[PDB]
Amino acid sequence: PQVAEFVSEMTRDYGFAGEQLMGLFRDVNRKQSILDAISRPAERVKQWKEYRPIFISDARISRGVDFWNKHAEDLARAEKEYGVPAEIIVSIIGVETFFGRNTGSYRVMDALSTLGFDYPPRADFFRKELREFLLLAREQQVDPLSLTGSYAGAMGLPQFMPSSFRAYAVDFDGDGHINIWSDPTDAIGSVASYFKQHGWVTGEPVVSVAEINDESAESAVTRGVDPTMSLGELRARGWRTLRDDQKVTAMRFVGDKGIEYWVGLPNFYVITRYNRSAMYAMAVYQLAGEIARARGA
């Protein structure tokens, strides 16, 4: 019914053959397990002390260094062309999929159709991503049922949503295909492109350890990841850490040895564009640091 509607829209607006599409959707399955996963209540709070070691592990650093050893030239080329550190690219791929170990259990078509048609709270968002998916599959001339992703439709080594693939992904080995699923070279350039296009500033720092004077300084801790003040204003609130005329966020983490205070600079905010969590972005940054250290970068 609404499927027929979506199909009419793809036919009228996007130039798709109605019959070809209906044949496609006959093969698509509704997955109850996806509706359950997206439905889940909030998980128990993890302190930084619990969250960090999920990502900063012997195995994850080892596999990251291995990934870099294997893709060293591609990584140097992406750093040069996009002005984003190699270690940040490697870290994103390590955090998202463990360098291609865990790239999602579903056909993208099943996930996006299940959510687009059968999950009211976010049906519009996923219906849009379904349309973007159909467009990218046509552009790349690949069978739409051949591509995998997470239960929420995120695809390949870097877990790009379909809309991000179309906006930001690149053919980084010049073969005329964009394959972020099994071509690490395209994945590497695609992550670098995403970061440059979300405002990464080449050569600027990302975070700084801080200490505070007084309990009153805790009032400046940022709610969420959007900055509300300059670093100079944050220093006036009693934080000690950099240029003062930049917008920063202020973090208070419960770490392995006690409370840690951190200042997030604009490049930190760029990382949170990938996933809007201060802990996520700190794990990406700290994992990048450890991998770069092991590489001698």
The residue within the footprint of Ca ion, chosen from 5, 27, 175, 211 (CB under 5 A), is 175
Would you say 175 is a known binding-site residue?
A: yes
183 is in an annotated binding site: yes
Q: Give the residue closest to Ca ion by C-beta.
A: 171
Please state the three-class secondary structure of 23-82 as a single string.
HHHHCCCCCHHHHHHHHCCCCCCCCHHHHHHHHCCHHHHHHHHHHHHHCHHHHHHHHHHH
- Minimum distance from CB of 139 to Ca ion (Å)? 13
173 vs 233, beta carbon nearer Ca ion:
173
Cα dihedral sign, 151-65-190-55 = positive
CB of 136 to Ca ion, least distance (A): 14
Q: What's the first-to-final CA gap in the chain, in angstroms? A: 56
Residue 204 annotated among the catalytic residues of the structure: no
Q: Is 177 a residue that touches Ca ion (CB under 5 A)? A: yes
5-64 residues near Ca ion, rule: CB under 5 A: none
Amino acid at 94: G
Residues 6+ apart with CB under 8 A from 206: 264, 265, 267, 268, 271, 285
233 binds Ca ion per the rule CB under 5 A: no
d(CA 218, CA 200): 28
Q: Residues 61, 186, 285, 291: which binds Ca ion (CB under 5 A)?
A: 186
Q: Which residues are annotated as a binding site for Ca(2+)?
A: 171, 173, 175, 177, 183, 186
Q: Which residues are annotated as a binding site?
A: 171, 173, 175, 177, 183, 186
The residues carrying an active-site annotation are 96
Residues engaged in binding Ca ion (CB under 5 A)? 171, 173, 175, 177, 186
